[model samples]
Target: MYDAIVVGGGFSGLKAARDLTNAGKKVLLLEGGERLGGRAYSRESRNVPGLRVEIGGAYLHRKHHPRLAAELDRYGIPTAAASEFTSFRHRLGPTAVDQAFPIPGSEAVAVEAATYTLLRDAHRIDLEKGLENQDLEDLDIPLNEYVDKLDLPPVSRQFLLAWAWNMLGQPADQASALWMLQLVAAHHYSILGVVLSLDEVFSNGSADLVDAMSQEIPEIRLQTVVTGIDQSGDVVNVTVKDGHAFQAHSVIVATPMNTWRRIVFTPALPERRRSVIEEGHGGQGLKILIHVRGAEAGIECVGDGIFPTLYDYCEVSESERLLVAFTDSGSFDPTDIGAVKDAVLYYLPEVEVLGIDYHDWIADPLFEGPWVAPRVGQFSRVHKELGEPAGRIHFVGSDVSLEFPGYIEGALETAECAVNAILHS
Candidate 1:
């Protein structure tokens, strides 16, 4: 029996498992996918106009992503602040808005400032005591409807949409109003003290970061799907898809909320937990990564006339001209070129799609959706309780995190929390 069995090998699982092992506990990490880092996984964008492009989780700012930055530094992976020159295309009902900030300081700073503040104040959810008294009714308002009720101007509303999509891969309409407010507020506050990068990606992919974290662990079982967890007492038995079982003094289920319902618990998860998992998830994403031969101009200017929601862009390299686009869920086949062309042209008008690649996280059975999105009144009621550990089985993921929940930062932060629990256990 291992000292701890960590189910899943995404950032949360890998981080928790590594922390446990470093704390002198033997950990067995089971990864259902061939790769690690979950949605943060990477794939090479080939034959692009510039250098190689990253199709998945791309940025890690020290402002909101301190843990990731710290880990990068620890692993000797070189990182540079991203360029501030950014363009944005806004799809507001009918009008298309194209705008660009001059040099490296203009709209980027304002947006960064807003996002920073949101992240900072949001972390306060558990800063004083915890979210024990926070109720679901307080956390579950739909973000778009909430934004609408707030009477934010169209520009501001679009900004919020861009903020939500750029980071969590969803829009405010699909998320909890309170949770989105906290997230927006936290990011708004968090970036105030830090330098902002408008167009930055790691010198190396996040995979390198995962590789470093997993370096110390010796017993990583790849392609292992955890189907059931039996926690009768102090000992927890983990059963995988292949009928393999492993017992550990404690277990950490560091998986996305999408998969939370699939892993059957001995007594089953509490009503509130199950409700949050099923009701709170950010279902399916129609993320498209496109490689264009003439993307330099496409990336330099924001197109209000076409793909208005497309914001994230970086030169894969000066030569490889790579660009990626993301959109909300409700999927058609990613392999469909017509849909891909329409989405791309919506943002980058007259831009030819050299090639396209994407996968629906929500469509995958293992991952019923993307990160967790709290509807009205779900977070206050369930967020805190979700991570309290059902006996020896602990939980961690962006969905369960108190700060920046449903983001890459939240994922890493939650992993740290679960890892701490394992160390203390």
Candidate 2:
């Protein structure tokens, strides 16, 4: 029997498998997809011959993503220094204006005030530990309710909507207010700090580090789906789709929580755990990489909509500039070039469109959705308990992380926590 059997091959699973093997434990990692990088997949652009685009996941700041950054350095991947977006362009329900700070709209002052107030409230969250006891009912309510109580002007309301709703890929009314607040807290309670800290994405779509770490792990089975996990005995039993079974001292389920309900536990999971998984998560995302020419230098576009919302989050290249469109609740066919053109036109109206690149994460069977957005009261009430393992089977994923849930960094955080648990076991 192997020391551990790691299901899933995303950043969390790959990191867990590597950490266990480094500790002198034999490990086997099974990935449902044919590839190892998981959502970190990137490749040469089919639309633009010389350009490369990311299907999922982007930006790696050294201080912000210190754990992922350290892994990059350890693997010998090169990265260039980068800085924040130099300019801002907002189309939040009004005249698109180009200004640096203090969002320009009819209610500019109110928007600025609301921004500072939200960031100020975010300070209550500890970076390492989330909100503590004391007025939990107020802070943990639905984010939409909290924002509605603010009673800000229209423009200011949309500005908050960009963060509370679109940013986390969940409806503001459904997602917990603490999730957005916790995210702001991770960036040191400064909205500017979060944008400023975004540095560079390593070459090859953040896959360089994955490929490097993968070289150290010898037993990796691709396209293998784990269907059941039985932990009633001393050794954990892992059964894959093909009726092949494997035994390990312990099993680490590093897959996304979206798949937890599908995997039958031997004695069944705890009532609440099963309930939470079956209840389902409403977080989903679309990363549309639009290749364009003449994208205004150092300027970013931000707006709100049910359709594909354009953020101009970053331009991966100068010669062949790229615009990353972040979508929220719209479920129409985003792959259609005509619809994408409309989204781009809403922001960079004059920029010449070359071609587009995108990935349908919702359509991807291995991952029905991305990251996470905890429901109201779940962040504080159940997050801590979710991290704790049931018997020898441990659960770890960005969805279950305390540090930076719903982010690439959180995946590594969970991996470290689970590996340490098994090491000490």
Candidate 3:
């Protein structure tokens, strides 16, 4: 009945479904959860009545995500200019950066050199074709080991550590140098590029774009769980949880990598594809928004702490500011208010917390984890195979994206390929 069946309603699925329909093909989208956007959940701030906050993946890089930038343009989505929010400053050092002075004396010089080293190494990474060759193996070690190898200043090491928490939703040691560099390259080949990307907030929440993209797609079925994809012949059978099966000539599986194992394939997938999902991705991370008294609205605090990254989210009132902070596993329970208070205090001792809000993506079965981050050696071993199509079932997700994994753009990148696959097959 359908020309193509798209499973999952995240950015990838939405993109594929929209493009197929635009191409004048019949498409059906299935999402198990009630909401779309996958891990990119944006809601009105609980404490700040009119303000918005993201409990999941957020941020848009102007150049790093060229297609995403174009998509926003097509939809007429507005974003606050990076210059419009210039008072926002980057602070990294031994103390919390809110009121603390800048970095050390001679050490500030070292940070600059290390920053150069980071940019240089990131420049060498082939963002699109990375890990497909042996040239990148030099950068495949644990990111912590790479930092130590460079012998970077304490502040610079903490910068990457905080970036680990901020961007990857995982710790520095748990991430790969190659993957980290790819993220850096994806952000614009400079740490400042990454920081500027953070400051440029979406006029609304990130959902503005997701909602805009979803509007183009027709025939989206929420709470429709796809359990099996039988790609036996020219026609494919997609069976859902309710035991109803739908037929399509071509199928695009745009779900997260973790959910692939749950879906049964007709002939089964090879070990390269099967083992990667079995080992799974290390995306278990948490984000919390806190309303604090006596805080300013334009400073980013980067350092190694329980919640390694904190930045001004928005102003709740003249005296109260809402800040976003992140930490992954090997940390205390984020729901623990006292621990959260202490984490906030570690950055700015004087601010008093008025309210806190967060969503546990790890606990949610639909997501299983937050943003994607491959561990040491994982990228080189399995990333290439992950992108390949199994029969007519083309896989697409930020998890399998080679250029810009862990970001919204990465998910969109895979959509173009799957659409082409369906057309060619």
Candidate 4:
């Protein structure tokens, strides 16, 4: 019997298994998907040869991400400063406007300043203390409703909408005000700082880090679907779909909340966990990669538009450029090639689309969704209970992390916490 059975091969599962093995414990790591690095994924560009693009979580924050920094250094993976691209905003149709600091326009500057002032003035949720530092009754509301309460101009409100959509991978109305504030606090309490904090990337895509981390771990079973888990006495039985079973002293469940709901628990999970699994997170969206010919600079469009955000990824060649665009899944169909090409052209009027690549994360069965963002009142209601272990099973993931929740750092932090708990016990 192994000391522990880790379900899911994401960063948390991999880290937990690796650390336990290093501590001289036998571990079995199982992943339903075919690969590792659950949401933090990267692959060679399909449109352009010799280029790598992240299909999932890509950026690494410079401030307050010590665990990620240490992992990068340990793996000998060099870091590159984020790209410096010119900013562009399009209101409607194909017309684009260049933006300067403070945005020179009627009420645009005032609205922008006012929004930042609110972000700056809002009480930041301490990363360690989480919701304990603030009153949930006052802060637990939809972010869009909170922004509406600000009563800003239409243009600025739309800009904030785009920003919130990109930040949370969900519409502002779906995200909680307190959770959004916690995210801002995680980025050092600067709205613009979080915008600029997309200032770091891996030298060889984020997959390199996953590859390096998994090198030391043994017994990682990919494409293995776990069907059920039962804790009986001192041992936990983990059964896969094919009738295979593994017994271990402890189990670590590191899969996304939505994915976890698929597994049958013999003793049933707690009501709080069941509710969180039912409610799900607010991170389902479409991530598209577009190869263009004439768009030399980066563009960011913030409005009630299709594919509101686009940025320069890298130059495929002297003539061809690669760009990544994000749009909420509800607004557009990412799988439709024609609609995707038209959306790209809408932002870059002069550019010719060479090719398009995208990942429909919402439709992926193993994930069912992307990262983590607490729904309206869910953050305050279940923030503490989501990570609590039940019987022999301990939950670990970015969704359960208290510090830097919804980020890679949070994944590692939660994994470490779970491993430490088992070790101490």
Candidate 5:
């Protein structure tokens, strides 16, 4: 029997396998998909020749994400410093206005006041220590309601909503206020600080970091879907869809929350555990990367338009650039080229669309959503239990991360925690 059978070949699972293997333990890592790096993925653009693009989990915060920083350095991954550029707030006009803030003078001041209030309130829950001292129920309201209490101007609110949608990867109202607060804390309590940190991109891509980590692991079975997990005995029995079964001293499930419903647990999981799986996490949206000519500076346009957010992705040449856009709403299909081009032209009128590319994450069975964001009132009620070890089965994923939740670092943090739990015990 192997010492551990890690389900999912993402960062968390691969890290766990590496740690266990390094500690002289037998480990087996199984991945449902064909490749590793579940959400942190990169590939050459299918449409744009000789151009590489990140399909998912692109950014690595310099100061905030320690694990990613360490791995990038360890792997000798070359990184480019992000360009300093002003954001444009367009009113669906032909030309966008250059502005320091999303809205005009006084309204911008009001928005800053509200933002500072959010950061201050978020600081109340000591991010370093966690939410043990606070009443999570009191803090578990919808983010929209929390913003409503701020009494921000309508335009400001809409602007914030678009930004929130981009951040949360879901509708703002669907996310928890406590979750947003935690995010602010994760970003070092400064929204602008986090925004500035986003400029640093991995030289090759985030996947190279995963490739470096996975090199140490011995067994990684791709295209292996885990169908059942049974911990009735001292050793856990993990069965895959391929009709193969493996026995291990412990098992770590590192799949996304929405994808967990596919697995059957022997003797059934706790009602609370089942509840978490049923309710699921946020992070459902469409990510589109467009190769276009023109568009000089990095753009940040926020409106009620089809594409809520768009930014300069990479510079292919002085004339050709890769621009990435996001839309949280399900109204438009990302695969439709004509619709995507129309949306891009709405904010960037001068650009000539060379080609468009994107990953339909919402349609993928292995990853039902793009990333994890705790739902309203779910953070306190289920967050603690989601990662707690049940018998010999342990859980590790960014979805259940208490710190830096829904980030690459969060995935690594949980992986280390799970592996440490098994090793130390």
Candidate 6:
């Protein structure tokens, strides 16, 4: 019999399984999707062999995501950095950034530092200290209200809202100020540097990092969906979508909060976790990659305030070029191909969109949400309890931890925590 069974094969599940296996524990990992990596996965078109696109999370910063960088180095994974030759620039009105040039000298650094300052202060107010435990009762304020207390300049507020919306997949006012600050603090703690440029922010691909992390694990079950968990007296049974059940000493659910809500728990979960999941409290984060046809090739541009937050059409290799854009829900529509075409116009009027593509995370049952952004008071209430083991079940996912909670590095960090909890205790 296996010592533990982990559900969901994304970064969290993969990382948890890898750690448990390395600790000489018998671990079984189940995945509902066809691939591992979860939000960290990628795609390559059959119609366009040379062209590769990221439908989910892809970009990574050096200082904040050291685990990601270390994974790349460990696997000897070479990366294709954003083209430095020519950059498409823009100028937002007073509400957004003033202008964009060739990323300037160290624009990424400046932005990182400014963001870090706000987060550090927030974390201190919310948790008092890092890695210790704090429940939601400790935090009762909403993020929007908390940010308003910052008394930032109007333009700075807009900039923070726009950037946070783009990155966290939630409106600044909607997310919990404490949780928001906690995430910012996590990034600050993870790094020793200021910030990085848009060009400096990238991913080799979701699978590239997962491939390196999961290389040693042999128990991962792909294309398998978990349906139920039956536990009693420290022993548990895992039921798959096909109705096949496997018994293990303990269970670790690593899927998103919504996914957990669908699971049939023998005694049900704690009230707070259930309430958050049932309310569907999460960010409407979506990404679209477009194939374009234009004259000025190999250029990437970013626009502030809405959809197409980062629009860059650059050469993936010497042979082809692609356009990638990210946005919050209101501005981005996956069903309306025309919406994507129109958004491209906001950033680049000269180029025409040849094709539009996206992954369906909203409607998919396996992964009900793509990005996690806690509402005003939710973060302080739910952040740390995420990975706490329940009876015979353990939890490990970016969503559950305070540090880098919704990122790749945070996912690994959470996995390390869960592993330690299961092994040490």
Q: Each candidate: RMSD to true structure?
A: 4.7, 3.1, 2.8, 2.7, 2.6, 4.5
Model 5 agreement with the true structure over 19-89: per-residue lDDT tens digits: 89999999999999999999888887877777677888877776788887887888798787664456575
Quote the lDDT for 340 in model 5: 78
> Model 1, stretches more than 4 Å misplaced?
46-52, 83-132, 135-139, 165-168, 188-199, 297-308, 311-320, 331-333
- For each candidate, what is the lDDT? 0.64, 0.74, 0.78, 0.78, 0.78, 0.65
Span of ten consecutive residues with least summed lDDT in model 4: 93-102
Off by over 4 Å in 6: 46-49, 83-88, 94-120, 123-157, 189-204, 295-305, 316-320
Whole-model lDDT for model 6 versus the true structure? 0.65
The TM-score that candidate 5 achieves is 0.91
Q: What is the C-alpha RMSD, rounded to one decimal, of candidate 5?
A: 2.6
Q: What is the Å distance of residue 145 in model 1 from its true position? A: 2.9
TM-scores, in order shown?
0.82, 0.88, 0.91, 0.91, 0.91, 0.83
Given candidate 4, what's the lDDT at residue 141? Answer: 88
The lDDT of model 2 is 0.74
Stretches > 4 Å off in candidate 3: 47-51, 81-105, 112-116
Among residues 3 or more apart in sequence or in different chains, the pairs in candidate 2 whose N, CA or C atoms overlap within 3 Å are none
Better candidate by TM-score, 5 or 6? 5
Compare candidates 1 and 4 on lDDT and give the better one: 4
Candidate 2: misplaced stretches above 4 Å? Answer: 81-88, 93-97, 102-120, 126-135, 154-156, 293-297, 305-320, 329-332, 352-354
Q: Model 1: what TM-score?
A: 0.82
- Looking at model 5, residue 16 earns an lDDT score of 86
lDDT by residue for model 1 (1-425), tens: 99988887877888788888888888889888888778776665554433444555566567667877778778899766554444554454333344442213334555455555445445555432335454335445666765565454445446555545544445555656556555544455443222242334677776778788888788998888898999865678888888668898888888777677788899787776787776645544455666665455345333222232454355555544445565565434557777777777776675677677666666677677665655556556656788668778888876677665655777778878777766665
Q: Per-residue lDDT for 81-177 in model 2, tens only?
A: 5434666666775553555343555777776677778877887776554444334556888878888877887655665676555567776677777
Which of the two, 2 or 4, has more TM-score? 4
